[PDB]
Symmetry: D4
């Protein structure tokens, strides 16, 4: 099954900075999928991590702690350290950020559907109330808990721009349609 290369893989290495590429390869292999086979899930993991990093970059100095991109065990270690210091309740599943100005965890989703339908899926997949949720699509829409978008207009806007240019650079190498599906 494992091939020598692939269009999607070449594009993923061309399009994203090498650091988030290694981090995505690692997140995937830690859960048992091969980056070079499930290449659409590879592109998805890279986009998700890049969005998480821009989001953490969008705030004040050290407003966020980054939970995504670490190994699961260290991830949970930091989750426990945050809970047993703030007092917030240990969530059921791993968030992507903790947000100290507003004292809450954040799940970040990136979707090729309607912000409504993923938000439905992930909101009742969480069903933990406390943890905030924030969705972007490849079209430029977002959707957040209590319509509380956590960041400023300009940063969220930079995330939307980046998602749209990624979609255009998948459409140029007719990889967009295969990617949309899933």
């Amino acid at each position: 099954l494992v091939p020598r290369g692939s269009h999607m893989e070449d594009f993923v290495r061309q399009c994203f900075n090498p650091m988030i590429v290694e981090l995505a390869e690692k997140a995937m292999k830690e859960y048992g999928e091969d980056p070079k086979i499930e290449t659409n899930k590879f592109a998805a993991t890279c986009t998700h991590l890049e969005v998480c990093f821009m989001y953490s970059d969008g705030g004040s100095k050290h407003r966020f702690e980054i939970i995504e991109g670490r190994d699961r065990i260290m991830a949970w270690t930091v989750v426990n350290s945050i809970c047993n210091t703030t007092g917030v309740e240990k969530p059921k599943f791993l968030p992507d950020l903790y947000d100290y100005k507003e004292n809450r965890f954040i799940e970040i989703g990136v979707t090729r559907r309607e912000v409504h339908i993923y938000y439905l899926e992930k909101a009742n997949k969480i069903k933990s109330e406390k943890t905030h949720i924030h969705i972007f699509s490849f079209t430029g829409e977002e959707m957040a808990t209590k319509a509380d978008y956590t960041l400023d207009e300009e940063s969220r806007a930079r995330i939307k721009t980046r998602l749209f240019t990624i979609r255009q650079e998948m459409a140029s190498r007719s990889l967009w349609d295969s990617f949309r599906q899933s």
Copy 2:
């Protein structure tokens, strides 16, 4: 026609940082002029890019997206990503920045004439209304749409200083007069 060297070329490499030098060589070759022949247009492209970079540096954190200095195709890709996210109308010609605090594209001109006369030329060359315009000269004048200079006094002042010192370092190697013409 292509020579081994040239005074203007030596001065351009001495005077500007290497990165914007490579970017200018590339902008020029992409449109079919040789940096080592049209050397005055070389110095012009380097000055224009440096001003664009100082301008983008003049604002808050990531207030600007830089459109100039990219390849035309990627340039247009980012323009489409910005339009299809903000809602602003896709301009007719490539701007130099997008400005998210104020939600608009910016053309930056640098002129060896009167800010009035270039502003006339470029304003009705654009004739797109929406896109903002901002002119500096090698004398220290500026002119902007709605007299809205977008940045603070101090940054614009730093751009004027740099333009004047460039003009002095062209006058020392009697390259200024040839440059003025065109």
Copy 3:
């Protein structure tokens, strides 16, 4: 007595950035204990320095001068320079920071007991009044003079998180209990 290695030493090098590791080795050897023998005091010195650095990082631009992590003689040199410039009285023992927004020295303690009991010990060990005191524990509590925590909620919170994750990474290699004792 001096061994070839040790679990605590391997963990200290794995867990802390190399710079504060060298600084801690140096603080210890300057007072006559071998990092590779007194390994619990090694981990303590590394934690204390890391907390001092995060604390100095928590403020505005250059709000703090770092006194800890220098050699004792240079340390006292900077203490004299601060006193003979501000006017504040030369403390009896070396603080960890000077804090210019609030014009005072700061001792930072890190404890595996109750903030109350260490605060007692160090507060009457100081008995200099003027110098501020600030304690963190490996549980997430703090205690400060005049309940004046000097920094913002978010930064202190980041220090508590880091202390708790250090405690978890000592508990995973059953080194926590030995460490607690002392």
Copy 4:
């Protein structure tokens, strides 16, 4: 099963340079074992790669091509490129080096047994004749095909030294005995 840490893991990160550490994590995850669980196999993979690198470093300029430390697919890609250029027959299993001065592939083994018994196992595991074999132990013995040790006394000697010091640094953290077993 997956823990927060481990003595063997801390030692492996302390003892080997980070590059071969990442390469070993990757070789292991590519075949489905978790570096943080099978920690003895982790230390084994790191030792094996370091020996392969010193071996390739032992020769003239670019005498060797390194086959070990690449992904399996690229590994086989380079094997095919070597075969279809030299004329040597495509081996049944992946070697560790190709050796151009002597025109042959090399398997490198590192053993905690007798060079005789591993050499038996790996020699009839290969049973390909053409590919050379070269074994080192943690005691300082080696064994090679046709008693042709490929390198000079001094380099092989440096590999033996390094293996013995690794064994001493496992014995100091009483990890040696567990490691020996397997």
Copy 5:
């Protein structure tokens, strides 16, 4: 005509080191073809430069002067400097190396045909006698003037290996057949 991307371009950036990539973009634009359109000629220019660099790397200390990868004018400048110092006759067309141990220029060709047929084409395209010629193919054959291969078996062998692995990494992304043609 100019697109947003392309499979061949993504592969060329994935497969070659960035430096020779920039150099190839520049060689091409200097003669008026766009790297992003004529992508097969892009891959060809990158392969040719990489082979030239490995060739220059194959000799003693500073045995070669590299003529390829410079701008045409500087290229000719170095050719004149070599002629007017050694005494060898100024060739009609730009070589790829000068070779000081053997006092002669070298053209290096890389072909997807028979070394015989390209050697015919380039040998009577040169028809300058003095300048040496050296051809490699993507199959592992070479052909040189006076059967004088200039380098040692091992280095030429490394060039053949690299060419074959490039051919395999074009065949994996079914770009090989399009590339062969031309």
Copy 6:
């Protein structure tokens, strides 16, 4: 006259960062004194430049333009660029900074006397009114035009601290008294 070394020179290289050391050697040689002979004037030039750099670092983003540490000709070039852009009058002698928030040049003096007596000397040496003046001593005093200290308490305080620690590190190598004189 020129010696092989000197205590003051060794101390100057130990005490200051190499960049300002090279800049001071250059300022001195440009006016015809040898850093290795007039070593007290060497230490003075290094202290003066370091204070100028901390001062420029004390403000907002790019609030200052640094005039000191450049060659005299480029220095005057930047002075002309600032005048012919702001409108402020071209001073008689080279200042150390331009200050754009407050639109004025700044002379910075560092004295081993009373801020009053140097301020007298330099204020009527300037006698240009427009240019601001700012004096520090090695004791911790300052004195500024219109008692307008331009910066915040904390930054000026950091400059005083640094001056006092320099004085202590000259007193330790009994170089202070020789230095005081002059």
Copy 7:
């Protein structure tokens, strides 16, 4: 006793590269003398280490293993690894190099006396026969076991040059005479 500075210390930091400076501070503190008090022994330790490094640099590729400059425990670890691999007998005291071309340990002395008298002292201080001995002085003499100088004329000559220039740079800061004594 511990001072703020010292002429010898400033000279030692000016004269030697920072790496061997840190290594010497560490060798000294490991045996209980303070670099800033016993400053002559500081200069001696730095000279000795620099000579050891030039010596190891004087041979082929990896002809030497460096024993000096490591911590005593790791030092002995490498000594055991060398003995239990080569077969040579474990010396009584720590050498400075192992020399694999000639299969023996080397003590390197650097003396301000006659090569004869130190050679006497260190040769019967060793009284281990097997370990080679090699002395240099600050005058340009050497003395070795079996008159076997291990290296080539040119390298030993470079070590003599460096020792003499160190002696001249101590004589310029009248530190030579104090240094000679001891």
Copy 8:
């Protein structure tokens, strides 16, 4: 007299690597000429130093000690260290290299005349016999004592090539004729 720029200065910074540029500025200022006025002597000093560096690079490992490019005092310090170690007689004037394989100092001249006439001038300017002499011109000729060219054909050939290309890059900016004169 001191100007803002100059064609020759721009060319010197374009043509030579920055390190030898700083070294030449320093050699010149140490003897009292301003690099920006005597620009032809600037280009001469840069060419001379570059040739000295290529010459030292032409030999084995550390065959040469570089005397040129240091300050005069350190220069003489190294000359004394070499004499008082080898036994060769202290020359009257500063050479450019010492050459340990052949145990002698080397003056390197670079001339725009006949190797005969400079060799005459410098040979009886030296009149020290012992010190070797080696001249190159901008045409490709050399001349050495006892026709002993010290290096191999290939390296000297690389120095001739570089001199000729420098001459061509001065002729392109019609600076060659002014340079020739003097």
